Amino acid sequence: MKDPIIIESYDDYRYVGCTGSPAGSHTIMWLKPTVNEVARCWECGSVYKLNPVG
């Protein structure tokens, strides 16, 4: 929940899709960090972050 993984957004509130890793580890699933915030998986359990990017 610091800064684990980056999802390049261009919106403040956008979703993510992971499969665990670039190495295809689990299924596919969908989360949403926010510019201020973070979000956790349930399959890999990785936390993911949004960026302030415009």
Which positions touch Zn ion (CB under 5 A)?
Answer: 18, 20, 41, 43-44
Q: Which residues of 17-53 are buried (b: 16+ CB within 10 A; e: fewer)?
A: ebebeeeeeeeeeebebeeeebbebeebebbbbbeee
Residue placing its CB nearer to Zn ion in the complex, 14 or 20: 20
Question: Measured from the CB of residue 1, what is the shortest distance to Zn ion in angstroms?
Answer: 15
User: Is 41 known as a binding-site position?
Assistant: yes
User: Is 26 known as a binding-site position?
Assistant: yes
User: Is 18 known as a binding-site position?
Assistant: yes
| Rounded Cα–Cα distance for residues 42 and 36 (Å) | 21
Residue placing its CB nearer to Zn ion in the complex, 38 or 41: 41
